[PDB]
Design a protein around this ligand. Structure first.
Ligand SMILES: Cc1cc2nc3c(=O)[nH]c(=O)nc-3n(C[C@H](O)[C@H](O)[C@H](O)COP(=O)(O)OP(=O)(O)OC[C@H]3O[C@@H](n4cnc5c(N)ncnc54)[C@H](O)[C@@H]3O)c2cc1C
Ligand code: SF4
Ligand code: F3S
Ligand code: FES
Lengths: 243, 119, 577, 130
């Protein structure tokens, strides 16, 4: 029994020692089923115990798996060594500050996600009265956008967020759009202020590469466009607003 | 870290015209560039169809008065709005860029309105 | 150490933990609540659940039917007064989740749709498509943001809890990014750390599921209850162990040997049902335990297909068709294509039994309270007495929101009437946690933690499978004890402060080793077969209600030895038979 | 004192050269240049046609220049790229459900091309035939 080998480039960084990130190369055995996450594990156990990374689910559902692979945002979780036969380079998730090795500071994300108030607002129904009534039709209005797992992959992909850190971002607008379009939600006016901002929807120039990298096929770029149309509608109403 | 009360963007207005400017141009521009750009100076047209006499007859008429205006004005607003963002995309710093580009647009829009009412 | 003040502290950002936070914030608007987790809340393992949440909704259903299903399914190791409370609060809790915005699947008339799971006669399971766990957690998490009472310690690792004079008074935790230590003082603490599945080599569990919460309870003289009962899921991918939902079988998928002969008819699960028409309790909808066992029976005969990743059975679904897959099973398709290189349209998927759920856990009374005053356990890390010898499919999620609410509400009562403990003693208790940390770091002797991890998993895999023998249970007990001594010769070669996972994983392996020993001793001591725990030695083939109708309690003493006691089982309205 | 020192990677002006996807986006925005250029030329024509037959004759001789033909050829190629891309993106603006499924943008892309196809001929007919 003999398994084929691969030389993987991993970009390492230690705040204690390193001034800047530098590369380190590791010979790692692989087969048809070996994921990047598997390979990272192998290094930690045998080649280097000082390697750090985030992961949990092992199956592209948790989202803590984000990183760069040959300048591409991917989840190590679902990246396969069989594909990168020629060579492979693993950097920390782009557009984010590097805390350590492959571990990044994702405060802005969480905070952007917070700002939009992603929860049911102003529905006074109580439990002992049974559920709301929502038709499969009414549901298909927001359903796709509800499936986001906060991977961060879209933020790394978005050039605009690269140029502007303050921009609330695709994932965040998408989630705001999710509740806006929910038949059970009466908090549309609560989260428009953020979306109407320049750091809101009006930082997207419809590049669309975020929709391209989404592992969960949310298509956040469409949420933004709909968001721009909705913001325009609001702007119009607000122009005639001196009541 | 994130502003509780942000300023409403003025963007919807520029974006509004940009949308119509983009649509008009996608639909009508190809055929127009064909006529004016290629057919006319190569002379590839049947008889006296694009002669000074006939073009003027359309130009002076009310329908062609509105048409020429929109064919010129709308695509500018689309085009210029884009260049304004290209600057920011190329990390090129243009002072009062906003006013510069839309300033240009308004000027020409006026020049054309002036043109289509005849001089 | 920086100190913190809080009315109560919840350890774990999973479904149950979040439910507890929300409940406490509503029970008291002025409370200051500390929500601690080693990962960002949305990464908790609850995110991985696909099937659904059991709650009664149908006209022709009854709470008695759900009660009977669970008690019988738990093979009469259920605290019947607890099960009763449970069934009655499911409707209320699931509805509340809908109210907060959970996208439950619907009937054409806009009402809530239910589907069948876990062998229940009347299908009462509510489901958010194929993403029920993802939806429940994200709904619970996004809702918690509207409450300023909850202060969250993201990526914070909890080392030990603070006890004096039989009362909890706080905890010790480490900021993961900084590597700094912090005290949090609260007069009530809720444990929501999930199960211990990661202690087995092949599992369906996320990396984080390492048995920490139980490991802390043990060290403070709290027993772990019914730890020998471990649930295997019949269909997981080979090597990785990735779950394939029962929904696949629920749509009419088949299990076959190397000869493509549907093997389930052999073991009393006959007669064979038509492809399009799958019947509950027959063939592929046969009981969790039976199907699991059947694989092992077919394994013995040399009927299993052999892959470089292990011996497998085939779940054929390619005979289903495109349109059927996409409406209820689209996730499964994408898993198959990526992980095993299989299209459930073109080819068969390799699968096998895989270690899934922890029925055992920290001992709790009807209130989720431990023997230590002010300490609570809820969720998979706990043992409320609901599941008994075996867990009914889709009851775990239901428990999280039902008992999460109760845990959260009771802890708020206990915090208010707690009074004050001895300041000097508590502080000294926390000093000793830090000293114990320094002690591990100074440790030397060149043992790789990884190799000790790998060997424990192998031992649990071979020692505590579906079928169990005294020879093999002892071999494991012996192995673990050897590893216990070996753990003392490990050196953590990384000394870095910032996000040092070398240190973390090694500590997590600690709690693992401890817990595995509780499973192993309990299993050995129970000389009968009941639910998940099955023995082959003579006189242990059948369930013994005469001698073994009692809960197993596992204690770890100061000398490092695992002691056992037995508690009686509460039976309110339904006698054993 | 904290022991962590967060490292921020920069973002160059040439960020778009690195990936083929970005390059295409750049180019799509690059259509705006010729789009302005043509709209400019029409101003020339409007004024030259206004100044009388003599001035218009010189405006035509300007277009007779090879460079203008070449630059206008590029302009048409540019307009055409805009069309293909605009039609791909606009449909993502409306979120419409037919029955119980969110409708695809494929039927909309069709509608737009048809409207262009009919518009082109109808215009070419009026322009050339009479
Ligand atoms: C693949 C799969 C599918 C399933 N499907 C179903 C289903 O369909 N229906 C059903 O009823 N049940 C299902 N289950 C079982 C059920 O979902 C789980 O038992 C349940 O999610 C447990 O919830 P919990 O909150 O107790 O644990 P978790 O949700 O796992 O909570 C773990 C939390 O504890 C934290 N934590 C752990 N250790 C520490 C520490 N030392 N310090 C600080 N924080 C810590 C983690 O950060 C995490 O936030 C499934 C399980 C799996 C694995
Ligand atoms: S939109 Fe897609 S890429 Fe973006 S965070 Fe969500 S799941 Fe990840
Ligand atoms: S990549 Fe960026 S630019 Fe808008 S389309 Fe997605 S947020
Ligand atoms: S490990 Fe969960 S998303 Fe990769």
């Amino acid at each position: 029994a003999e398994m084929k080998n691969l030389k993987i480039e991993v970009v390492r960084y230690n705040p204690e020692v390193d001034t800047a990130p530098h590369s380190a190369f590791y010979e790692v055995p692989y087969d048809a089923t070996t994921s990047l996450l598997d390979a990272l594990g192998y290094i930690k156990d045998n080649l280097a115990p000082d390697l750090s990374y985030r992961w949990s689910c092992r199956m592209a559902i948790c989202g803590s798996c984000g990183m760069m692979v040959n300048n591409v945002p991917k989840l190590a979780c679902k990246t396969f060594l069989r594909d990168y036969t020629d060579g492979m380079k693993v950097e920390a998730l782009a557009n984010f500050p590097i805390e350590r090795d492959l571990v990044v500071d994702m405060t802005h994300f969480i905070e952007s996600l917070e700002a939009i108030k992603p929860y049911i607002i102003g529905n006074s129904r109580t439990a002992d009265q049974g559920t709301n009534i929502q038709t499969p039709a009414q549901m298909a209005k927001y359903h796709q956008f509800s499936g986001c797992i906060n991977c961060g992959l879209c933020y790394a992909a978005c050039p605009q967020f690269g140029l502007n850190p303050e921009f609330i971002g695709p994932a965040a607008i998408t989630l705001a759009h999710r509740y806006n379009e929910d038949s059970r939600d009466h908090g549309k006016k609560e989260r428009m202020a953020q979306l109407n901002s320049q750091n809101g929807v009006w930082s997207c120039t419809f590049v669309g590469y975020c929709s391209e990298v989404c592992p969960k096929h949310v298509d956040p770029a469409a949420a933004i466009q709909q968001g721009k149309v909705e913001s325009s509608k609001d702007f119009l109403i607000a122009t005639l607003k001196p009541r | 870290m994130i502003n509780p009360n942000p300023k409403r963007s003025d963007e919807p207005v520029f974006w509004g015209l940009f949308g119509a400017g983009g649509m008009w141009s996608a639909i009508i521009a190809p055929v127009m560039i064909l006529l004016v750009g290629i057919l006319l100076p190569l002379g590839l047209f049947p008889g006296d169809a694009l002669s000074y006499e006939r073009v003027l007859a359309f130009a002076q008429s009310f329908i062609g008065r509105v048409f020429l205006f929109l064919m010129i004005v709308l695509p500018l607003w689309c085009g210029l709005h884009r260049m304004h963002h290209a600057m920011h995309d190329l990390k090129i710093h243009v002072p009062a860029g906003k006013w510069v580009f839309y300033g240009l647009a308004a000027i020409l829009t006026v020049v054309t309105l002036i043109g289509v009412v005849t001089i | 150490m920086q100190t913190f003040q809080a009315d109560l502290a919840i350890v774990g950002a999973g479904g149950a933990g979040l439910r507890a936070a929300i409940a406490a914030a509503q029970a008291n608007p002025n409370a200051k609540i500390a929500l601690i987790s080693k990962v960002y809340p949305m990464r908790s393992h609850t995110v991985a659940a696909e099937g659904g949440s059991a709650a009664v909704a149908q006209d022709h259903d009854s709470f008695e039917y759900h009660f009977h299903d669970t008690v019988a399914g738990g093979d009469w190791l259920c605290e019947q007064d607890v099960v009763d409370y449970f069934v009655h609060h499911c409707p209320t809790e699931m509805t509340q989740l809908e109210l907060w915005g959970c996208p439950w699947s619907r009937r054409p008339d806009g009402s809530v749709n239910v589907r069948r799971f876990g062998g229940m006669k009347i299908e009462r399971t509510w489901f958010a498509a194929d993403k029920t766990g993802f939806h429940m957690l994200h709904t619970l998490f996004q809702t918690s943001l509207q409450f300023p009472q909850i202060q969250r310690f993201d990526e914070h690792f909890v080392l030990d809890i603070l006890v004096d004079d039989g009362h909890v008074r706080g905890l010790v935790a480490m900021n993961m990014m900084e590597g700094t230590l912090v005290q949090i003082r609260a007069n009530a603490v809720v444990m929501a750390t999930g199960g211990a599945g990661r202690v087995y080599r092949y599992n369906t569990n996320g990396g984080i599921v390492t048995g920490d919460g139980m490991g802390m309870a043990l060290s403070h003289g709290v027993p772990l209850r019914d730890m020998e009962f471990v649930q295997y899921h019949p269909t997981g991918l080979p090597g990785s162990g990735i779950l394939m939902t029962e929904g696949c079988r629920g749509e009419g998928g088949i299990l076959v040997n190397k000869n493509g002969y549907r093997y389930l008819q052999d073991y009393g699960m006959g007669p064979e049902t038509p492809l399009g028409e799958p019947k509950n309790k027959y063939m592929e909808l046969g009981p969790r335990d039976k199907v699991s066992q059947a694989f092992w029976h077919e394994w013995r005969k040399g009927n299993t297909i052999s892959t470089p990743r292990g011996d497998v059975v085939y779940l054929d679904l390619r005979h289903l068709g495109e349109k059927k897959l996409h409406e209820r099973l689209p996730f499964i398709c994408e898993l198959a294509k990526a992980y095993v290189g299989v299209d459930p349209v073109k080819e068969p998927i390799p699968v096998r039994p895989t270690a899934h759920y922890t029925m055992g856990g920290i001992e709790t009374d009807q209130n989720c309270e431990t023997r230590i005053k002010g300490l609570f356990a809820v969720g998979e890390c706990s043992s409320v007495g609901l599941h008994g010898a075996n867990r009914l499919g889709s009851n775990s999620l239901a428990e999280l929101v039902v008992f999460g609410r109760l845990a959260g509400e009771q802890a708020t009562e206990r915090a208010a009437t707690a009074g004050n403990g001895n300041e000097a003693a508590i502080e000294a208790q926390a000093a000793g946690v830090e000293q114990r940390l320094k002690d591990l770091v100074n440790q030397d002797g060149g043992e790789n933690w990884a190799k000790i991890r790998d060997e424990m998993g192998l031992a649990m895999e071979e020692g505590c499978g579906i079928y169990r023998t005294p020879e093999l249970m002892q071999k494991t007990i012996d192995k673990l004890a050897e590893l216990q001594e070996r753990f003392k010769r490990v050196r953590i070669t990384d000394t870095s402060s910032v996000f040092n996972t070398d240190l973390l994983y090694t500590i997590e392996l600690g709690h693992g080793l401890n817990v595995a020993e509780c499973m192993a001793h309990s299993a050995m001591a129970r000389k009968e077969s009941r639910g998940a725990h099955q023995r082959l030695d003579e006189g242990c083939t059948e369930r013994d209600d005469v001698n073994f109708l009692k809960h197993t309690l596992a204690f770890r003493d100061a000398d490092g030895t695992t002691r056992l006691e037995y508690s009686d089982v509460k039976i309110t309205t339904l006698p054993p038979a | 004192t904290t022991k962590r020192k967060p490292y921020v990677r920069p973002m160059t002006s040439t960020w778009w050269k690195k990936l083929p996807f970005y390059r295409f986006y750049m180019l799509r925005e690059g259509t705006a240049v010729p789009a302005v250029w043509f709209s400019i030329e029409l101003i020339f024509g409007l004024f030259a046609l206004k100044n009388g037959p003599e001035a218009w004759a010189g405006f035509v001789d300007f277009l007779q220049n090879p460079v203008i033909v070449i630059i206008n050829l590029i302009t048409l190629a540019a307009a055409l790229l805009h069309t293909k891309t605009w039609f791909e993106l606009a449909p993502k603006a409306a979120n419409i459900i037919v029955k119980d499924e969110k409708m695809g943008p494929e039927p909309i892309i069709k509608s737009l091309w048809a409207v262009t196809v009919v518009a082109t001929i109808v215009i070419l007919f009026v322009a050339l035939y009479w």
